[PDB]
Design a protein around this ligand. Sequence first.
Ligand SMILES: Nc1ncnc2c1ncn2[C@@H]1O[C@H](COP(=O)(O)OP(=O)(O)O)[C@@H](O)[C@H]1O
Lengths: 913, 306
Amino acid sequence: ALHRHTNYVTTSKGLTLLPKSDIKNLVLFCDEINLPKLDKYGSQNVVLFLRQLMEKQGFWKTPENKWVTIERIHIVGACNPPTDPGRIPMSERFTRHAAILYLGYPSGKSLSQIYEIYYKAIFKLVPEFRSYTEPFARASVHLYNECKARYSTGLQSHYLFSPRELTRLVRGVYTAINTGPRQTLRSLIRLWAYEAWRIFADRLVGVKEKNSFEQLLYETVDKYLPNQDLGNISSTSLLFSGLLSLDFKEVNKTDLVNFIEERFKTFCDEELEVPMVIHESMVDHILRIDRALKQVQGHMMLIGASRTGKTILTRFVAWLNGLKIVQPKIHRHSNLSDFDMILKKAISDCSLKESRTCLIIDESNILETAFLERMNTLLANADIPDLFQGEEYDKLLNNLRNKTRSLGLLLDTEQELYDWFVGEIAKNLHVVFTICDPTNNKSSAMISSPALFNRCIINWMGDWDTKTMSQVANNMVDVIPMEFTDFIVPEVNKELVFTEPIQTIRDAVVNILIHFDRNFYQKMKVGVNPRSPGYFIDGLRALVKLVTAKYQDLQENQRFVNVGLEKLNESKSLTFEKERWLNTTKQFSKTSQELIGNCIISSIYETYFGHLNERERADMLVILKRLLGKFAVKYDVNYRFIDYLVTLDEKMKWLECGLDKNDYFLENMSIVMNSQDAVPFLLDPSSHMITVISNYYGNKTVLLSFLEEGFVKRLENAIRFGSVVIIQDGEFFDPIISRLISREFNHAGNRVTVEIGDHEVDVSGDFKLFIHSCDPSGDIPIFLRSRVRLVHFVTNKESIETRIFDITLTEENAEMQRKREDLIKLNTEYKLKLKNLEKRLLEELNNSQGNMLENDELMVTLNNLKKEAMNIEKKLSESEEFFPQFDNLVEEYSIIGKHSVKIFSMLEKFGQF
Amino acid sequence: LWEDVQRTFETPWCRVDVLLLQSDLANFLRRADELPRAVKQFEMYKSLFSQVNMLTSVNKILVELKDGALKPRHWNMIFRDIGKRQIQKNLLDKLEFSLKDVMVLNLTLNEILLTKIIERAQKEFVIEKSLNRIKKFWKEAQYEVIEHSSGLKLVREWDVLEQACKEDLEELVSMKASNYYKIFEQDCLDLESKLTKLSEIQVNWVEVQFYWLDLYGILGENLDIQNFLPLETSKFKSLTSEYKMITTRAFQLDTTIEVIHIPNFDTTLKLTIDSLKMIKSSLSTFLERQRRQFPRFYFLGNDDLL
Ligand SMILES: Nc1ncnc2c1ncn2[C@@H]1O[C@H](COP(=O)(O)OP(=O)(O)O)[C@@H](O)[C@H]1O
């Protein structure tokens, strides 16, 4: 930092000095002087360097070992009180040399005058309300005071208020008045309220504190600006934006939503394609991000939860304002030099070319504290001196000197050139941090950092509320047909319903999905929910595709039965009894009513239960069934996921490939294979699945890992020639595969292209990706975990609970165990072979149009089909009594297993010791 | 205008540019109406306007078939399966057919089969681009040469080319998984064969060069040690002479890959490395025989003992 303003010199008695470059004295303002961390032995070296500079008046060059005597350079530091969090105490050996001055807040009453001067300044644009300069200021000050007392650090660690918030509010009020239309008192009050919302209540967490701030705003307005014509001051009730008009005026909600939709469609088309649904919170946050990006040093920190839309929302808002989006393409083996080069390129584009970039820094786009320090230096100043120093400085000053000449402005001094450079960076570079969970150590360090927290506008997206989920679901379940279930409006409590009052099956579906998501997060997740619905969206998409597929299947079966009935009605003595056995047209009416319920259960099972135990799956399935029963949607009472989704052929293929006989493993494999809209993440301690998948894909399987050096290239081959990829490690993850984890491709005429690192590679279309992990203890990045279909292949303790049953019933009721398996086995093979015989009969009738000798085979097969009809009826009648007895018999051996699992837990604890 | 539009219809497809074609079609549309009614009543103006409207009706098709992925094989398939005719091979292989043929193919209707064949065209070009990149890289690769005290030439930076050869071999292996590999098999197989031979020569060469450097410090410099081991140094001098001739003839080629065509190169390097390993074993046995006579030499090592 000193290299720009200091000039090393040499003298015989004056071995190298480091004085001013100019003739003016130099004052080193070291802000946050007590912030740097201290070594493990308890000594922070930067403070000792400062003491050396103030006591010894010099230091030692580390390459050359020469005493450098600083000349007429002064040291002025600034520090928060040591009692503040993160403030390391400073040694008395350093502060012994410095005069300490305490600067408190300006008394709380002087703030009134200090900002009344600002309001008198900014009301020169609107003289008609000159007399309102004094009220506003007091109100503003009062607001600040209240927000300082209500929202303390005890609630949230980022609830730090200061007069800087008041200055931001005054600048916002001016920059809305300056570019706004002719104003009225109601308009000014609403404008001030909007700016107050954006300054004080953006960082607030939870609807309780937002409502508290809203009532505080109402009280302040009624106390200091007792106007009589005002609307609702809620966050979504007032919307100020210059996207529609050329001014900055409060816009109607409907026009804003229509414009946002018609622009978002174009953005999804011409830019990267991600099918997305527009809702009210999206519009509000688009306005917030637009306001932040519009100002000069507009940096934002979006603290939400994964899969909320923050990154793509920032990209959309940048595209609206014509900002070049730059995202650091870093990976696991990316060091500080790569980040420095990326920042250098971004700065060069920002200044030497006036590119107006928008650097989106994710939480995972920083790996060590050096990246965060680079962000601090870039944000606190408007430049990073460490990038441009030494000879690289000499080039920069050259590139400035040419460039500043091309703009028609003359600047020959180095200081003037660098000041123009800093100003261009400040007014052209916007940094938008996006962090998923703020309780993580990296994200907590990002938030608590002084430069970021003081320069960035903390916008707390948070997780989706029930209104946003209802809007998204309504816009997502409006594509699939539901004109066959014959829904009847059910009687439910007003608290249970989330969308508009239930009048159709679609509202019931969205209510069930929202309620199950809430219950699932209530059971699995504890305390606060830093997880935004990615399960909800994936479940909605799965339900859409599954309803479509199941209705197509039902249509095909109905068509087959109807054409068979028509053929039989066209048809010599026993076919009248196949008129009876074609009563399945009556069964179709019952099985079509339960189609939506079965599809909901199967989609929820595919999405949520991938990473659950054998008992958690049962409990949450019971919860989902009681939720379906709470509303008026029906489902197959004896529903089995394996029977419903996977067919016999696929199950036999999986068993042949090497999969176990467990129902848990069959369900896990069904989840892995059936759901291929998202990458599957197979977790298993034994690697027995890695071979199984390979056995499924023969010679096409390619095994990689995130540890080997050539992996980055090898995938680029497998991704270009269509070979199934299994990555042996998943706990590690280099974000270069990021554009592959989320299906975010660059389409063209007929070639689909994906960006990996900085290479664009063509996707064959035969390429699958399975991520595989071994240790369940290992963690996966929040970006990966919420995008990927996590499937647990572990053999938990609860696997004992069922397994001993299959032993007990084997040696306690041998005949009952024998009938249990063959009941379902014969049932399934009957549902296949009766259809087989029906199409046999149909094609035989096709071949028996007018012959007589051929009818003997027709008659004998007609008599045959009666046998399987009797067996089907007998099996159904026997099951009607077997299932009650089976469920009665389950509970006894469940009692046995309750002790068995405890015993095994104790044994495993012993083994752990 | 009729002469101009007839001339623009006869330009070879290998030279047609859509950017100027758009302006030319705009001019044709502008100048169609200004023709007098004598042209309008005749078939000349009607045919001209119909052909101009045919050209302007499809413009995505023209730019898609202007892509580099298209090849004479694809043009032959398009002509045979859509145009129902055969194109002269000289007219086809150079893509010099006129725009009238493109009109004949009737891009408006057969666009579904057109896109079906173009998709195959881009995938085959995905394979061909990797093949061309590998060939271009290995037609310009060369070692980095230095000269030490002796007249021998030494290679530096083995990795920058060894890793490239290994990665290219892995790429050529992985190309077999692609469905559209059959047409490119006859070239990929030969390229893989050449790269395997080059990789074997590289593996022998790095070891030969390393062992020769290691032994040059021991033998060939100190006269005393060569006197204690006359057979070893006598063999070493002949090895150095043969290696010098081999390396001079090898770097007289300006390309790394062409060493696979040098007569008796890989076997020569195998013999050289075998003889160097035998000389190293002889040194080890001599040093151990010296240490077993005065065992305190076990506290010194090899360089000190030498
Ligand atoms: N309104 C919405 N409609 C549909 N899907 C959405 C919506 N908002 C977010 N999503 C889903 O959440 C993801 C958000 O993407 P992105 O913003 O890039 O990641 P992050 O939210 O973690 O920053 C998208 O993949 C999208 O599928």
